[PDB]
Amino acid sequence: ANPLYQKHIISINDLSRDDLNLVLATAAKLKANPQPELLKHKVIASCFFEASTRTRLSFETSMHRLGASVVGFSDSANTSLGKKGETLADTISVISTYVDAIVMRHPQEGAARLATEFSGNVPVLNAGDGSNQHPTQTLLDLFTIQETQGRLDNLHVAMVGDLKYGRTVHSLTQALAKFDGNRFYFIAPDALAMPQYILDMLDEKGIAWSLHSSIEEVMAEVDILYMTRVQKERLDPSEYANVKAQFVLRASDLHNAKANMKVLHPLARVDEIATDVDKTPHAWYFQQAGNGIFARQALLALVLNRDLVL
Amino acid sequence: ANPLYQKHIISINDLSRDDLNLVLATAAKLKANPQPELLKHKVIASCFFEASTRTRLSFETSMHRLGASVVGFSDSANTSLGKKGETLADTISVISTYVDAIVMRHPQEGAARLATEFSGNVPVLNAGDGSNQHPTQTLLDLFTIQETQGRLDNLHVAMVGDLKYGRTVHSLTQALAKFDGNRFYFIAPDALAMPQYILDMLDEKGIAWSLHSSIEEVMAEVDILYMTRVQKERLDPSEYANVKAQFVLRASDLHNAKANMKVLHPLARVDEIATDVDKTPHAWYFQQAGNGIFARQALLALVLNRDLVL
Amino acid sequence: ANPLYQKHIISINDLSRDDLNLVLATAAKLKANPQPELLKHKVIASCFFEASTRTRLSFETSMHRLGASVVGFSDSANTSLGKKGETLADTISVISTYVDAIVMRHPQEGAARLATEFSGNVPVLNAGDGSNQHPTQTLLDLFTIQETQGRLDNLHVAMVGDLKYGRTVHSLTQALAKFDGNRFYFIAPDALAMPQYILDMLDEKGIAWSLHSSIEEVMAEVDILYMTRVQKERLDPSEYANVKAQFVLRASDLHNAKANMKVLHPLARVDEIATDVDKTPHAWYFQQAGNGIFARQALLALVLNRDLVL
Amino acid sequence: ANPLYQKHIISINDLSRDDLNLVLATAAKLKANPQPELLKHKVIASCFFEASTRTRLSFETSMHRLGASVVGFSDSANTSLGKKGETLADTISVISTYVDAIVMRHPQEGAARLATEFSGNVPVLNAGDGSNQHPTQTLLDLFTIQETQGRLDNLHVAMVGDLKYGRTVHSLTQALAKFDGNRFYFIAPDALAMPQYILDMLDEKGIAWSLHSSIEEVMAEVDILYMTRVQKERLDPSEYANVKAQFVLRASDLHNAKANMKVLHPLARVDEIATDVDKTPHAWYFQQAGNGIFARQALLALVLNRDLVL
Amino acid sequence: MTHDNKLQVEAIKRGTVIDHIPAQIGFKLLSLFKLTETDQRITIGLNLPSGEMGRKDLIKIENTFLSEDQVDQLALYAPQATVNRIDNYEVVGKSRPSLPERIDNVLVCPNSNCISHAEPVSSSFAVRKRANDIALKCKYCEKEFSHNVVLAN
Amino acid sequence: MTHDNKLQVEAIKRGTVIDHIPAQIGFKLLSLFKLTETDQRITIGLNLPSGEMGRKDLIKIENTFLSEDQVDQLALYAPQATVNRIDNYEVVGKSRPSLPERIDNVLVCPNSNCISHAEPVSSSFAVRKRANDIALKCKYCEKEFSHNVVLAN
Ligand SMILES: [Zn+2]
Ligand SMILES: [Zn+2]
C-alpha cells in the first residue's frame, strides 16, 4: 500500500518530508487530469464543530471533485445548547461507524488526535484544532510555494504579522525547515514576534533566520511574502494603530520585487494587504487558495486509496 | 454556443424576450425527459447569505436532478459574528476558484452583480438580492403562466397586495410588457399600490393597465390572479386590519371565474388566500412552485452547456 | 378644590380645555417656587414593561424631586416573550396594593386603560401605550409652547416628519384644537401624511389647516415647527433618500423664521434637525425635553393631593 | 473656599497634589463624623452605559448615604448595538436638564470628557471610560494607602499583574508621583510589562523604579503590593499557565512581609490572591473596596457645594 | 504699451482649458476629479470676475489634455463649461462639455442598502433626463434617482 | 532674471498670500484648513517654479488676514510656509510657521475607540516634540501618538 494510506493526518510535526513530497507530488500530478469518481461510492464526513466556511467549502469541494459523498454539519453557536454532557469521544465512535474518513474542525486543542483513539479503522484528517495544527493549511501553502517558486528549497521566506499566536506561520515554518537552505526573515511587532519556541530549533538545524521591523528592508531579498493577520482584539486600539503601518502591505513597496516573488496570505484579509496589490503579479493569495483543493484532494486520495495508479 | 451560455443571470431587466423564450422553452422541453446526469462531474455552489429554504430547497433540488454536486451554506443570523471585515469581494474570489457556477442570495442590493466583477469565468445566478431582482422567481412565474394559459401574450393579469414594495410583482410586470397585449389590472391598498416607477414605462409601451380596489370587480375579466403578500409590519395593525378584507382571496369570489384562469402566489401565504380556495382549480400556486425546478434547471443548463442537444 | 385628585390620566381626549389649563398653571408655579418634600412618604411604581429611559428617567426625576420615592422596573421578561405566564391584570392588581401611585409604559394600546379597571384607588398615569396614547408628552410640548409664545391660541403651528404614525403628532393637534384660533400646516411626505380621520376632526371643528410639499413655504408665518423623527424603519432602504432631503432642517433654512419662532421635537433626533441649529436661537428642543419635568411634576401633584397651596 | 465646586472630574492628570490632598482630608472626616443629609433634595444620574455593579453600587451607596437620591441605569441598548440611534451628546444634553449631577461609566475613551462639552453647569464625574480613565478608583486606592501607611510619601510601592493594560495601574503611579519620594517595583510578565511612555514619565520625574521576574525579591521592603487581575482573556489559553505561577500570592510567600505591609487589589480577584490571605493580617483588599465610599462621598460633596463646614 | 487701466490675466503658453466653471465649483471638480496628482503646472483661476459673472472658476494646466470622455463627465457639474486645446500661446480644439450616458467613479448612491458602500467597486450611475431632473440609474442596486439627490449627503 | 528660463509668479492686489508650499500639499491645505470656501480672488499656482531650484505650490488668496495662530496649524503638513500681509503690492508683514501648543479640527484620532469618531465635536489633540517625533495627545481619549501615525490615514 501507499506510504500514506489510512494514516490519520493530524499534525504536521507528525508528517514527514517524504510524505510531504508524496502529498504535493500527488497534488500537482493529480492537478493535470482529475477523476470525478476516484473515491466513488464513498462517503466522507465533515464534522465542523467550529464553523469556518473557507476550509469547509474547500474540503467539501475537493470531496466532490473526487466523486465522493459528504454527510456532516457546520455547527455554529446557536447550538451552544449542545454543551450538555455528550462527549466527543462518543460523538466519534457513533460517527465512526457511519463512514470511511472523518474531516473535523474543533475549538479545543486535542480534537483530531483524540478522535483517533475512538475511530481507528476510520482515518481522520484535521481541518484545524485549537491553536495547534492545521496540516491542511500548511500543505496548500507549501504546494503553492512550489508551484510558483519552482523549487521548495533555498528560498527567501518572509513572514509578517502576528507571528506569536499565528498558528499558520508556526506550522509552515516547521515544515519548511524540512528542506535545505530556506532563508527566513520574520517581520512582526515587538510583542507579536516569533517565539523562542520555533526559534531555538530553527538555529538547532542551522536554518538561517532573521528579524526586521519593516518589510521595506527585506524586500529586494525575498521570494515568498506570507502575510499573516494582525488582529485588533489582540492589541489595544491605540497601540494596534501605532504598531501597524509597518505591518501592512501596499503596491508602493513591491516596487523593487524580484519578479520571481509571490505574496501569500492564509486568509482572510481586512487591513493588512491593500487592494492595489490585488493587481501586481506578486499577488498570489487568491490563486494560492485555489490550490487548496488539490493538496486536499491528494490528502484524502492517499488516505483512501491503498495504491495510486492514475 | 447557446445564446445564453455562461451569461451571468443577474437581473430580469438584463435578460431578453428571446433569452426568455429560450429559457421557458428549454424548461418545458426538458420537462419531458430529464437527464439525471446532464451537468455530471460538476459542482455548483449555493451561497445563501440570507436564508430562504424555498428558493434554497428548489435550487439545490434542481441541481441534483441534473446530476450535479452542491457545496455551500444557508447562513442565518447566529453567524452575525461574521460582520467583521471579510468582504463579499474576497468571499467570492476565493469561492470562484472552487467551482463552476455560483448561486447566491444576499441581503444588500448589489449582491450578484458585484460578485460578477470578481468571478467572471464563474457565471453566477441570482436567487434574490436586496429588494431588487429575483430573476428566477419571475421565471417560474412566467413559464407557469405559459404552461397553463397556453399563451404568454394577450392575457388578463391581476396583481393584488403590496404592489409597492413587492419585488415579485415589479419583476413579473416588467418581463410581461415584453409581450403584446397583456391587459394589466392592479389591486392594492391606496398606500401599497403600484409606483409610477413601473407605471410610466407601462404607458410608454402602450401597455393597457388599470387599477381597482376590489378583486370582485376585475374577476369575470381576468386570466392570472397573482396574489402577493400584504404584511402586518408594513402597515399599522389598525389600518392593516381595515384595508385588508378587500385585499384577500376566498372561494366565494372565484364564483364567476373564467375556467381558463389560474390563481398564483409567489409564496408563502398566511392571511391572503384562504384554504377553501385550495380546492377550486384556479388554485395553482403549489403546482406553480413545482415548475420552479424546470425553469431553474434550464437556467443552469444553458449557463453550463455550450450547446444543448437532448 | 382641584379636579385631578385620585383621577386617571390615560388618553388626551380624556382631558379638558381647563384641565390642561390647570395642569399647566401648576407647571409654571412648580417651576417658579418648587415644592421638594411635596410627596414625602409616597411611593410611585414606575413600570416600564417597554423600556424607555428618556421617558422613564424624567418621570422618576420628577418623582424623586417631589420628595417621593420610586419602586419599579425597565424592560420586562419574567422569562421569555408572550408564553404561558402572568397577565397584566394580575401584575397590576398585586402591584396596586403596595404602591401609592402607578406610572406604566407599555407596547400595547390600552394597557394603561386596562390597569384602570383593576388598580383600585391608585391613580394610574400613562407614559406611553403603543400607537394609542402618550399624554405627558403632548403636555410638555403644549406647556412649552406656552412657555414660548405666551399663548396657546392664535398660533401658526407646523408639523413636519411622520405625521401618519407619529404618536406625539396626532395627540398634539387633538389638544391644541381645545384652544382658540390655530392654523395647522402639514409638511410631510404623502406616504406619511396626516391620518385622515384627524383631518375631519379639524374640518368639523372649523380649524384652519393644509398640507405642503417643502417647508420653505410656511417658514415665514410659522411660530412653531414641531419636528418628527422619520424613523428609517417604516420606509424602504432607498425611499428614505428621495424625501428626507427637505424634511430636515439646516439653520440655512431658518433665515425667514419669525423672531418668536422655535423648533420643537419629541426626540431623539438623528437626521431631522441639523447640528447647526443646536447653537442658533430658535433651537428649543432640549428645553422642551427638560421642561417636561414640571408637567409631570405638577401632574403627579395634582393627582396625589386634595388641595394644593401653591 | 474649596477648589472642587461645580468642577469636573475626568482624568487623574486633571488633578493636583493638593486637589487630592483636599479630597482625601474630606474622605477621612466624612468617615469620622459623617454628613447624612448633606445632599438632600439633590439628584444624581448614575449612568452606566457599560454596566458595572461594584463600581455602580458603591457610587450610589455614597449618593444615598449623603441624603441625595439617584436616577439612572445599568447596561444600555435602546434597541441593539451601534445602529442608527441617539448620540451620546444628545443623551447627555437632555439628561443634564433634569438631574443635579452626572456620574457616568462608558466603554469609550473620552465619553466622560465629551459629556463635559455638552452638559451645562452639571458637573460630571467619571466612573470608568475605557482604557482611558477611572479617577475615583485611583482615589480610593490612594486614600487607602494613606489610611494604611500614614503617608503617601516614602513608600516602597509594588505593582504585580497586568501593568500593560491594567487601567487602575497606570493611573495609580501617575498620581503617586505627585507625592515625594516613592520607589516603584514592576513585577509582571514581560508580555504585560509597564507601558513605556510611563517609564519615561518616571525617568524624567527622577523617580526610583525597576522591573522584576518573581515577587519574592521585593517582598521585604515593599510596604504596598497592589495586585492586578491578569484576565486570562488577553492571553493564549496555554500561555497563562507559564506565568501565572508566581504572579499570584499565597500567604506562604507573605512571611518576609514588613509588618505595615498590606495587599491591595482593584478586584475582582479570581486567581491572583489566594484564599489563605483573606484571613491573614496584610489582607487589605476588601477594606480598600469598602473605603472607596468615602472618596466618592467626599468627592461628590466637594463637587456639589461652595463651602463645607466639616 | 502701458495705457489707462492695469487689467488682469493674459493667455498662458499651453495645456488644457475649460472655460466657465460655476459659482463655488472649481474645487468641486478639482477634488471630485483630483486634478492635482499631476507633475504639471496647476495654476487655478479662482474667485475672479468674468464679464458680468461676479464669480467664476477655471483650472489652468500645462502639458495635460482633457480627454473627450473627461469632458462628458463634468457636463452635470458644470453645464456651460468649455474645453479646448491650447497650443503655444494659441488655443485651438473647441472641445466643450456634453452630457454623457455613463458617469464613473465619482457619485454616491443614496440607496443605503446598495452594496456600493462596503465592497470596493467603481460607482456607476447611468444618465437620463426628465425636464428638471437628470435620472441617474444605479449599476448595482438598479435604483432610479435624480441629480438633485445623488449630489448630496 | 535671465538664467535657466521660464516665466510665471505674479502678485495681484491687497491680499494675504501663502508663498512656498511643499510638493503635493497645496490643494491638501485648501481642504484641511478651509481656504477655498470664500468669495475673494484666488490664483493657485500648484506646481509653479520658485527661485530656490524647486518648483512647488502657490496659494494666492486676496482679501484675508490670517492669525499667527492659523499659520501654526500649517506646520506639520506644509513646513516652513509663509503668509505675508500684502496691501497694494507692498508687504506689511512676513509670517512664518511655528508649532502651536494645540492643533485643531482636521486630524483624525487613530484610536478607533474614541468618542470622537461618533459624535458632533471636533479634533483637538495637543502638541509636543521629542528628537525625531512631534507628539499629539488627543484631548478626548488621552492616547499620545506620532506625527506620521496621526497624519497618515
Ligand atoms: Zn446603488
Ligand atoms: Zn482620541
Start and end residues for every CATH 2.30.30.20 domain found in chain E? 101-153
Q: D72 and chain C: CB distance < 8 Å anywhere?
A: yes
Same domain? B63 vs B180: no
DSSP alpha helix (H) spans, C117-260: 135-149, 167-176, 196-203, 239-243, 251-254
- Resolution of the entry in angstroms: 2.7
Q: Is F22 annotated as a binding residue?
A: no
What residues have CB less than 8 Å from A102, skipping those under 6 apart? A44, A45, A47, A92, A95, A96, A115, A119, A122, A123, A124, A125
| Phi, psi values for residue D43, rounded to 5° | -140, 130
Cβ-Cβ contacts under 8 Å, B237 against chain C? 131
What residues have CB less than 8 Å from B245, skipping those under 6 apart? none
Query: What would the DSSP string read from start to end of F22-37?
Result: -TT-HHHHHHHTT-SS
Question: A130, A111 in Cβ contact below 8 A?
Answer: yes
CA of F113 to the centre of ligand 2 (A): 7
Question: D40, D65 in Cβ contact below 8 A?
Answer: no
Identity (one letter) of the amino acid at A122? V
Identity (one letter) of the amino acid at D126? N
Residue in the block written with cell 491542511:
A136
Same domain? B180 vs B203: yes
Question: What is each CA distance from F81 to C230, E46, F18, in whole angstroms?
Answer: 48, 21, 7
Same domain? D129 vs D177: no
Residues in a beta bridge with C106: C129
- Give dist(CA B291, CA A93) in Å, integer: 43
- Give dist(CA B254, CA B268) in Å, integer: 20
**How many alpha carbons fall within 13 Å on the CB side of residue C105?**
22
Question: C281, C46 in Cβ contact below 8 A?
Answer: no
Q: Mind telling me the catalytic residues of D?
A: 54-55, 84, 105, 134
| Phi, psi values for residue D171, rounded to 5° | -50, -40
Q: Is E98 annotated as a binding residue?
A: no
Cβ-Cβ contacts under 8 Å, A165 against chain D? 236
The per-type count for chain B, helices as H runs and strands as E runs, is 9, 11
End-to-end CA distance of chain B: 15
Q: List subunits contacting chain F, requiring 3 or more Cβ pairs under 8 Å.
A: A, D, E
Query: Are the Cβ atoms of D236 and A131 closer than 8 angstroms?
Result: yes
Nearest ligand, measured from the Cα of E137:
1
Same domain? D115 vs D167: no
Question: What is each CA distance from C100 to A205, C50, C112, C136, C240, in whole angstroms?
Answer: 83, 21, 16, 19, 46
Same domain? C218 vs C267: yes
Question: E27, F30 in Cβ contact below 8 A?
Answer: yes
Question: B125, B134 in Cβ contact below 8 A?
Answer: no
Range of the domain at D127: 1-133+292-310
Q: If DSSP codes are grouped into helix, strand and coil, which group holds residue E21?
A: strand
CB atoms inside a 10 Å sphere around CB C249: 24
- Give dist(CA C188, CA C170) in Å, integer: 13
Residue D149 grid coordinates:
501607611
Chains F and D touch (3+ CB pairs under 8 A): yes
Residues in a beta bridge with E46: F42
| Phi, psi values for residue A99, rounded to 5° | -130, -165
End-to-end CA distance of chain F: 42
Start and end residues for every CATH 3.30.70.140 domain found in chain F? 8-100
Residues in a beta bridge with E90: E87
Question: B69, B44 in Cβ contact below 8 A?
Answer: yes
Technique used to solve these coordinates: X-ray
Residue in the block written with cell 379639524:
C202
Same domain? A23 vs A164: no
What residues have CB less than 8 Å from C151, skipping those under 6 apart? none
Sign of the CA dihedral F113, F114, F115, F117? negative
- Give dist(CA D194, CA F9) in Å, integer: 55
Question: B73, B48 in Cβ contact below 8 A?
Answer: yes
**DSSP E strand stretches across chain C:** 43-48, 69-74, 101-106, 124-129, 157-160, 183-187, 208-212, 224-227, 262-264
Please calculate the CA angle A54-A58-A60 and round it to the nearest 5 degrees. Answer: 120
Residue in the block written with cell 396594593:
C97
Query: Of the candidates A139, A149, A125, which has an alpha carbon nearest to the alpha carbon of residue A63?
Result: A125
CATH number of E8-100: 3.30.70.140
User: How close E152 gets to chain C, by Cα (Å)?
Assistant: 9
Residue D147 grid coordinates:
489610611
Counting other chains too, the contacts that B252-260 makes at CB distance below 8 Å and 24 or more residues apart are B252/B276, B253/B215, B253/B216, B253/B219, B254/B219, B254/B280, B254/B282, B256/B219, B256/B220, B257/B219, B257/B220, B257/B222, B257/B282, B258/B220, B258/B221, B258/B222, B258/B223, B260/B149, B260/B223
Reply yes or no on whether A55 is catalytic. Answer: yes
Reply yes or no on whether B31 is catalytic. Answer: no
What residues have CB less than 8 Å from E95, skipping those under 6 apart? E66, E68, E71, E83, E84, E85
Q: Is F141 annotated as a binding residue?
A: yes
Residue in the block written with cell 407647571:
C27
Max alpha carbon distance in chain C (Å)? Answer: 58
DSSP D279: T
Q: If DSSP codes are grouped into helix, strand and coil, which group holds residue C264?
A: strand
- Give dist(CA D258, CA E14) in Å, integer: 86
User: How close D97 gets to chain C, by Cα (Å)?
Assistant: 5
Sheet with B183-187, side-by-side order of all strands:
B209-212, B183-187, B156-160, B224-227, B262-264
Nearest-by-Cβ selection for B110 from E120, E141, E144: E141
Same domain? C153 vs C281: yes
Residue E62 grid coordinates:
500645462
End-to-end CA distance of chain A: 15
Sheet with D262-264, side-by-side order of all strands:
D208-212, D183-187, D157-160, D224-227, D262-264
Residues in a beta bridge with D74: D48
- Give dist(CA C174, CA C189) in Å, integer: 21
Please calculate the CA angle A90-A95-A97 and round it to the nearest 5 degrees. Answer: 105
Question: B47, B105 in Cβ contact below 8 A?
Answer: yes
Same domain? A123 vs A153: no
Topology given in CATH for the domain delimited by F101-153: SH3 type barrels. (2.30.30)
Q: F146 and chain A: CB distance < 8 Å anywhere?
A: yes
Same domain? A116 vs A190: no
- Specify the DSSP element, H or E, that contains D53: helix D53-65
- Give dist(CA B229, CA F127) in Å, integer: 62
Please calculate the CA angle E106-E110-E116 and round it to the nearest 5 degrees. Answer: 60
**How many alpha carbons fall within 13 Å on the CB side of residue C29?**
15
Question: C131, C109 in Cβ contact below 8 A?
Answer: yes
Q: If DSSP codes are grouped into helix, strand and coil, which group holds residue E124?
A: strand
Query: Of the candidates D68, D130, B65, which has an alpha carbon nearest to the alpha carbon of residue A238?
Result: D130
Query: Are the Cβ atoms of E141 and B130 closer than 8 angstroms?
Result: yes
Query: Of the candidates D79, D49, D101, which has an alpha carbon nearest to the alpha carbon of residue D305?
Result: D101
What is the rounded (10 degree) CA torsion for B17, B23, B29, B34? Answer: 180
Length of chain D, please? 310
Question: E116, B110 in Cβ contact below 8 A?
Answer: yes
Same domain? A75 vs A196: no
CATH of the domain at A122: 3.40.50.1370
CA of F110 to the centre of ligand 2 (A): 7
Same domain? C284 vs C308: no
Q: Is E138 annotated as a binding residue?
A: yes
Same domain? C92 vs C106: yes
- Give dist(CA C89, CA C106) in Å, integer: 13
Cβ-Cβ contacts under 8 Å, D237 against chain A? 109, 130-131
Report the chain E residue with the minimal C-alpha distance to residue B113.
E140
CA of C239 to the centre of ligand 1 (A): 12
Query: Of the candidates E78, E95, E87, which has an alpha carbon nearest to the alpha carbon of residue E151?
Result: E78
Residue in the block written with cell 456620574:
D103
Sign of the CA dihedral B4, B5, B7, B9? positive
Domain count, chain B: 2
Burial (CB count within 10 angstroms: exposed 0-12, middle 13-18, buried 19+), residue F10: middle
Cβ-Cβ contacts under 8 Å, A191 against chain D? 191
User: How close B112 gets to chain E, by Cα (Å)?
Assistant: 9
